[PDB]
Every structure is written in structure tokens, then in C-alpha cells.
Amino acid sequence: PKDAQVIMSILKELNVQEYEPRVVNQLLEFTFRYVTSILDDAKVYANHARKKTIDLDDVRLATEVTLD
């Protein structure tokens, strides 16, 4: 709900005044997919560094290697 609102605000801010309701759903799914993809790689880096908590450097490398 909290995230759905952010997405609705982004749509309005970018001047998308009307949209099919499911666009929000699609965007929430993308959000999940993107974050999980980056975190999944970042976890490996954290592992190889022998860390328990994913850090900025892990997220930065994951993002850099999976394009930018």
C-alpha cells in the first residue's frame, strides 16, 4: 500500500494523468524483481567478503556488473 502510493505519485509527477489500474501492479512487480536481482548478487559479494550484512559496496558492484 505504502509503495503503491509512491508509484501512483510517480505516475502523476511524470504527467501520466490516466492509466490502467494494473500498471501500478506491474510497477510493484518490477520493483520487487529489480531489488531482488541486485540483492541476490550483492549477497554473493557479501559472502565472499565474509560479511553478514549487505553493504553499499556490495549493492554498487551488483548494480555495475548487471549493467549500470
Binding site: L14, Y19, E20, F30, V35, K43, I54
Partner: protein
């Protein structure tokens, strides 16, 4: 950094738990929340360009799919 709305760093934490990757440092969650918000704005922007190129005024799931392909 970013103008307009953005996904909270807190939401990144919830997602992290749902997939079992453990805890995220605050700076890592903030970076990800910012990055995903930037991605969301790009996806919506490109989708709206597709919509308009087609002379429509209501964004469709099809416009979003096209945008995700680009």
C-alpha cells in the same frame, strides 16, 4: 539527489527478508531505494512516450511491457 517521489529505504528491507538475503546496511538500502526509484521514473517515462507515439492518453500495461523491453 532525487526530485519527486521515491520508494522508501524501509521497503528494501522488507524485500530483503522475503528473499532470505539477510539484513541490509542503511546506506545499501538507501542506495537501492534511490536506484529503483530512478528506474521506475525511466520505465514510466518511456512507457508514456510509447503511449503518446500511439496517440493515446491513458497508459496501458502494454506500454509498460514495451518500456520494460527497452
Amino acid at each position: 539527489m532525487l526530485y519527486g517521489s521515491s520508494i522508501s529505504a524501509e521497503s528494501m528491507k522488507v524485500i530483503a527478508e522475503s528473499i532470505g538475503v539477510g539484513s541490509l546496511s542503511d546506506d545499501a538500502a538507501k542506495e537501492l531505494a534511490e536506484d529503483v526509484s530512478i528506474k521506475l521514473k525511466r520505465i514510466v517515462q518511456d512507457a508514456a512516450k510509447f503511449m503518446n507515439h500511439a496517440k493515446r492518453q491513458k497508459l496501458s500495461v502494454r506500454d509498460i511491457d514495451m518500456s520494460l523491453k527497452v
